[PDB]
Design an enzyme around this catalytic site. Structure first.
Site, PDB file in Angstrom:
ATOM      1  N   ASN A  63      -0.823  -9.888   4.301  1.00 19.38           N
ATOM      2  CA  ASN A  63      -0.832  -8.461   4.577  1.00 19.38           C
ATOM      3  C   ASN A  63      -0.506  -7.683   3.276  1.00 19.38           C
ATOM      4  O   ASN A  63      -0.183  -8.289   2.244  1.00 19.38           O
ATOM      5  CB  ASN A  63       0.185  -8.200   5.694  1.00 19.38           C
ATOM      6  CG  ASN A  63      -0.023  -6.920   6.424  1.00 19.38           C
ATOM      7  OD1 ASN A  63      -0.887  -6.126   6.093  1.00 19.38           O
ATOM      8  ND2 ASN A  63       0.773  -6.714   7.472  1.00 19.38           N
TER       9      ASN A  63
ATOM     10  N   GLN B 157       0.780  -1.229   0.000  1.00 17.70           N
ATOM     11  CA  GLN B 157       0.000   0.000   0.000  1.00 17.70           C
ATOM     12  C   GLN B 157       0.825   1.300   0.000  1.00 17.70           C
ATOM     13  O   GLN B 157       0.305   2.369  -0.296  1.00 17.70           O
ATOM     14  CB  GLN B 157      -1.079  -0.032   1.090  1.00 17.70           C
ATOM     15  CG  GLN B 157      -0.599  -0.196   2.454  1.00 17.70           C
ATOM     16  CD  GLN B 157      -1.685  -0.466   3.445  1.00 17.70           C
ATOM     17  OE1 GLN B 157      -2.190  -1.598   3.568  1.00 17.70           O
ATOM     18  NE2 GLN B 157      -2.001   0.555   4.233  1.00 17.70           N
TER      19      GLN B 157
ATOM     20  N   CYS C 299      -5.496  -0.028   3.408  1.00 17.28           N
ATOM     21  CA  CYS C 299      -5.571  -1.431   3.766  1.00 17.28           C
ATOM     22  C   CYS C 299      -6.939  -2.040   3.490  1.00 17.28           C
ATOM     23  O   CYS C 299      -7.034  -3.195   3.085  1.00 17.28           O
ATOM     24  CB  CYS C 299      -5.239  -1.612   5.251  1.00 17.28           C
ATOM     25  SG  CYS C 299      -6.299  -0.683   6.384  1.00 17.28           S
TER      26      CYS C 299
ATOM     27  N   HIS D  10      -6.831  -2.230  11.112  1.00 15.78           N
ATOM     28  CA  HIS D  10      -6.173  -2.692   9.908  1.00 15.78           C
ATOM     29  C   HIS D  10      -7.065  -3.778   9.340  1.00 15.78           C
ATOM     30  O   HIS D  10      -7.968  -4.290  10.008  1.00 15.78           O
ATOM     31  CB  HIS D  10      -4.769  -3.189  10.264  1.00 15.78           C
ATOM     32  CG  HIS D  10      -3.923  -3.612   9.098  1.00 15.78           C
ATOM     33  ND1 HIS D  10      -4.032  -3.058   7.840  1.00 15.78           N
ATOM     34  CD2 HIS D  10      -2.949  -4.541   9.011  1.00 15.78           C
ATOM     35  CE1 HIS D  10      -3.153  -3.612   7.036  1.00 15.78           C
ATOM     36  NE2 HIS D  10      -2.471  -4.508   7.722  1.00 15.78           N
TER      37      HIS D  10
HETATM   38  C1  LIG Z   1      -5.349   0.744   6.906  1.00 15.44           C
HETATM   39  C2  LIG Z   1      -4.441   0.046   7.925  1.00 15.44           C
HETATM   40  S1  LIG Z   1      -2.697   0.647   7.995  1.00 15.44           S
HETATM   41  O1  LIG Z   1      -2.562   1.894   7.216  1.00 15.44           O
HETATM   42  O2  LIG Z   1      -1.834  -0.355   7.413  1.00 15.44           O
HETATM   43  C3  LIG Z   1      -2.425   0.958   9.632  1.00 15.44           C
HETATM   44  C4  LIG Z   1      -2.568   2.283  10.108  1.00 15.44           C
HETATM   45  C5  LIG Z   1      -2.414   2.546  11.483  1.00 15.44           C
HETATM   46  C6  LIG Z   1      -2.120   1.456  12.338  1.00 15.44           C
HETATM   47  C7  LIG Z   1      -1.992   0.133  11.851  1.00 15.44           C
HETATM   48  C8  LIG Z   1      -2.151  -0.110  10.489  1.00 15.44           C
HETATM   49  C9  LIG Z   1      -6.274   1.818   7.514  1.00 15.44           C
HETATM   50  C10 LIG Z   1      -5.507   2.933   8.214  1.00 15.44           C
HETATM   51  C11 LIG Z   1      -6.392   4.180   8.242  1.00 15.44           C
HETATM   52  C12 LIG Z   1      -5.627   5.359   8.823  1.00 15.44           C
HETATM   53  C13 LIG Z   1      -5.453   5.440  10.198  1.00 15.44           C
HETATM   54  C14 LIG Z   1      -4.734   6.511  10.747  1.00 15.44           C
HETATM   55  C15 LIG Z   1      -4.163   7.479   9.910  1.00 15.44           C
HETATM   56  C16 LIG Z   1      -4.362   7.388   8.528  1.00 15.44           C
HETATM   57  C17 LIG Z   1      -5.091   6.324   7.987  1.00 15.44           C
HETATM   58  N1  LIG Z   1      -7.275   1.236   8.431  1.00 15.44           N
HETATM   59  C18 LIG Z   1      -8.555   1.190   8.117  1.00 15.44           C
HETATM   60  O3  LIG Z   1      -8.979   1.641   7.053  1.00 15.44           O
HETATM   61  C19 LIG Z   1      -9.498   0.571   9.185  1.00 15.44           C
HETATM   62  C20 LIG Z   1     -10.030  -0.781   8.682  1.00 15.44           C
HETATM   63  C21 LIG Z   1     -11.074  -1.438   9.600  1.00 15.44           C
HETATM   64  C22 LIG Z   1     -11.570  -2.695   8.930  1.00 15.44           C
HETATM   65  C23 LIG Z   1     -10.686  -1.637  11.074  1.00 15.44           C
HETATM   66  N2  LIG Z   1     -10.526   1.590   9.246  1.00 15.44           N
HETATM   67  C24 LIG Z   1     -10.351   2.741   9.900  1.00 15.44           C
HETATM   68  O4  LIG Z   1      -9.345   2.980  10.571  1.00 15.44           O
HETATM   69  N3  LIG Z   1     -11.295   3.696   9.883  1.00 15.44           N
HETATM   70  C25 LIG Z   1     -12.570   3.574   9.158  1.00 15.44           C
HETATM   71  C26 LIG Z   1     -12.776   4.836   8.337  1.00 15.44           C
HETATM   72  O5  LIG Z   1     -12.636   5.997   9.120  1.00 15.44           O
HETATM   73  C27 LIG Z   1     -11.381   6.166   9.767  1.00 15.44           C
HETATM   74  C28 LIG Z   1     -11.071   4.964  10.655  1.00 15.44           C
END
Ligand SMILES: *[C@H](CS(=O)(=O)c1ccccc1)[C@H](CCc1ccccc1)NC(=O)[C@H](CC(C)C)NC(=O)N1CCOCC1
Ligand SMILES: *[C@H](CS(=O)(=O)c1ccccc1)[C@H](CCc1ccccc1)NC(=O)[C@H](CC(C)C)NC(=O)N1CCOCC1
Ligand SMILES: *[C@H](CS(=O)(=O)c1ccccc1)[C@H](CCc1ccccc1)NC(=O)[C@H](CC(C)C)NC(=O)N1CCOCC1
Ligand SMILES: *[C@H](CS(=O)(=O)c1ccccc1)[C@H](CCc1ccccc1)NC(=O)[C@H](CC(C)C)NC(=O)N1CCOCC1
Lengths: 242, 234, 242, 231
Positions: B198, B38, B44, B176
């Protein structure tokens, strides 16, 4: 160190096996390791040959083995490092040097000059032999033996390929080394025919990073039997054996 | 757009098939496409969802199809692009948008700001529905339905994992999205685990993968895997 | 090992030198080495601190010196590798460990666990001390001392920045370490007041690769004095000294 | 269109200035931007010509500007994108296209095919003209005009150079475009060449190539084509 295909295919193809000539892709069956990038160095011969060994270990051992191209670049006296080399020479030196190193023990530094130092290798990973694949036997070899280290005549069109249906020129002479990892067939509109036709292809793993072509791969045209060669693929063609 | 597990498992599980609970790996059996990266984007959700569809297309159509995460990032109004999204929202938008594009038609540009442009997709690849997988049914669902798009509570230890027996901490909340591609067992005491794919490149984990402890039933979750858990259906 | 700003600036700023507070960019004067990429690892503290040392070497010795962040990651016991660290701890361990290693002797492997092994280093590159830069002295320090290793409060907007005029949020608290490499000013039309307005800014070198921001850099707003902080830059601010 | 050297130099060399033929390095004097990377694309002609304009803006405007090579690759009709081009054709097209874009407005994706869209650019950065530098005026042109876009005959040895005293082969014919950013001496006189294959080529992206005191000796056919853009 070379064995004959005739004898090798008897051992690897099951007695009652029937070859599916339409499609088989080692990416779907755990036989293909991530694409690498040779950066600014003519070490394609090392990526081809080592990648074919990576694939053989995945298939035969069902675990992830990542090996060092740099070790061959630095230590294969039968080849010329970044100035070029040969598939057979590379396998011969894999054997005579006492095996490959893991990628982490002996990381890739491309055109950076580096002395050969096998004392940096902890574990070593050998091959037993290798076998030349006849030009009329690529699908059978691919299905029962594994991915094939092959030469290719690469053009500028091939160099700048960024995916989609390949319509580029081929090179004059073989000048590059890649890996055949499968074959397939899709229906594609044929403009000299005015309708949909079966389009058979080989799937080629290149070593110019996953930003080249289609995730580092290209589909090249063949025919149902798989004898047709696009860009002279597999003029030299070998599978390593454990 | 959501189907019911009880009905779906009836259609997909052959009658008189018995589940091997010890081990099953879709990488060996035609159901897993290469790992992607990504880059510096929180997409993700796109990789998990799209990857589970790549896996279904592989299993049902017996060839490798590579689809576009960038299309979703750009065009899924129900999600927030690089700022995050949801598994269900991503499947709903795949349906509502008229399907996925190929990776070649609509290439990945991560955090590069880019407007939705579906004109550049030629062919399109739909799903009919998707099903939620009960937490007591992951091994059954993997074996007969295929790879599962799952949430996970990822920690710093998980981010810095580069191989070996995982013994790091878990995150405080699901954060995530990844894909369950199988399960296995090793003798370490027997050690049962799920195989997770992943989307942080092949130089994360073990070629892009991690084994996370379960039990023989497969009920036990490490890192709250699959709190949300969905397989897409064709 | 910490020196006193007041005594240091008196040694480095020439008598009768007058500060130009409009613009000064070390990238235009040979004081900045290539942008690097920390990959999946919280080693910003090591990129910040080592980078500022690369800059002092470039400025004072007028040659290219590329050093190893991985050595600090592996060997700095006062920091926590990929889990984070502190700028002063980093400088303290550079001194206690006996200096930095070259980038080629000790390459970067990010999150891959690696033992400290200083036998891998041939030549070593020391610093003498470091100095904390007061929040009212960044332009003076930049011009006469050099690039400054600073903390920054980075948000998600900052993470996803791909260039152009920055208008994202800032983080709550410092959570990242970058390098101040210069300052500038441009005239920008205010939509709005219908007037051109002077826009003063600092130039920040990040360690997320060349494909982040503007070739790895971001311009963050300040004032003519250079007192104004955007994203709490330089809450902690230090220059290493040879 | 092109300008004339004798007109240009009389105007740019200060009255009774004297050339120091021993050393002058624009990296130190505000005339060189960071090294870039063409990746797997034959767009060296774009990196050279644009880089020299980045250099001119830096010297004349005293601030760092990053310009778009991708715009020229996509939009220069007189050139052939990743398949190659010419230094003069490149400058012609930045004049005729109405200027260069910022790197931010029109980011680089090398061999990935894109159609010319200049609508992506807000601000534009023009040049007024460019001038050919005679065989015998490199050091002078360097000192008083700035970095020169030049052709070079690059070999396999050149491609695989990672630092140290260069003793490899030269190419058969000019096949590449670089930027001359100065000269120096250490007995041993040389030009300083900025390449576009990343900072992990050569000495942080640079190579010193042998010359003589007057700057007449050419190694690797450098500056067979030799131009400086003008503002
Ligand atoms: C993808 C996971 S990641 O980027 O690989 C990651 C980020 C932080 C910690 C661990 C892994 C995204 C990250 C979104 C993000 C978070 C903080 C700053 C910028 C971007 N995660 C998601 O999309 C999750 C997925 C779910 C199935 C749990 N969703 C999510 O965090 N949200 C839903 C949409 O609104 C915001 C929060
Ligand atoms: C790898 C191919 S490449 O570098 O990816 C490439 C180069 C040019 C065009 C398209 C692709 C190397 C390149 C060797 C090279 C060539 C020119 C300058 C420097 C290095 N190719 C080979 O090693 C081929 C492999 C055979 C299987 C065809 N071998 C080769 O070229 N030689 C063998 C040993 O002597 C040198 C010539
Ligand atoms: C580097 C910052 S980062 O990883 O590039 C980043 C920050 C914010 C947004 C996007 C990227 C590290 C990260 C440490 C970290 C944090 C959370 C999980 C894993 C790793 N930041 C630091 O090292 C900061 C630097 C100071 C100058 C503020 N220090 C730090 O976080 N710690 C000090 C030592 O103890 C651990 C905490
Ligand atoms: C850039 C040079 S390169 O690609 O960086 C390179 C040279 C040598 C070794 C390694 C890399 C381009 C190459 C174009 C090209 C050539 C062959 C195959 C694919 C791409 N060189 C040029 O653009 C030169 C520039 C002149 C100043 C020499 N011009 C050029 O090659 N042509 C002129 C226009 O028509 C095409 C040919």
């Amino acid at each position: 160190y070379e064995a004959n295909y005739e004898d090798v295919i008897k051992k690897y193809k099951p007695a009652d096996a029937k070859l599916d000539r339409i499609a088989y892709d080692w990416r779907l069956h755990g036989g293909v390791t991530p694409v690498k990038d040779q950066a600014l160095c003519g070490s394609c011969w090392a990526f081809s040959s080592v990648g074919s060994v990576e694939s053989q270990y995945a298939i035969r051992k069902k675990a992830l083995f990542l090996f060092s191209e740099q070790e061959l670049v630095d230590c294969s006296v039968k080849n010329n490092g970044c100035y070029g080399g040969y598939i057979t020479n590379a396998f011969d030196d894999m054997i005579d040097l006492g095996g490959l190193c893991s990628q982490d023990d002996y990381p890739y530094v491309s055109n950076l000059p580096e002395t050969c130092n096998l004392k940096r290798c902890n574990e070593r990973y050998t091959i037993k032999s290798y076998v030349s694949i006849p030009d009329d036997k690529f699908k059978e070899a691919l299905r029962y033996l594994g991915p094939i280290s092959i030469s290719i005549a690469a053009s500028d069109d091939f160099a700048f390929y960024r995916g989609g249906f390949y319509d580029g020129e081929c090179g004059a002479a073989p000048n590059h080394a890649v890996i055949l990892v499968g074959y397939g067939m899709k229906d594609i509109y044929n403009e000299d025919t005015g309708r949909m036709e079966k389009f058979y292809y080989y799937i080629i793993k290149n070593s110019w990073g996953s930003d080249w072509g289609e995730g580092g791969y290209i589909n090249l045209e063949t025919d149902e039997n798989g004898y047709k060669k696009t860009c002279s693929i597999g003029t030299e063609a070998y599978v390593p054996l454990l």
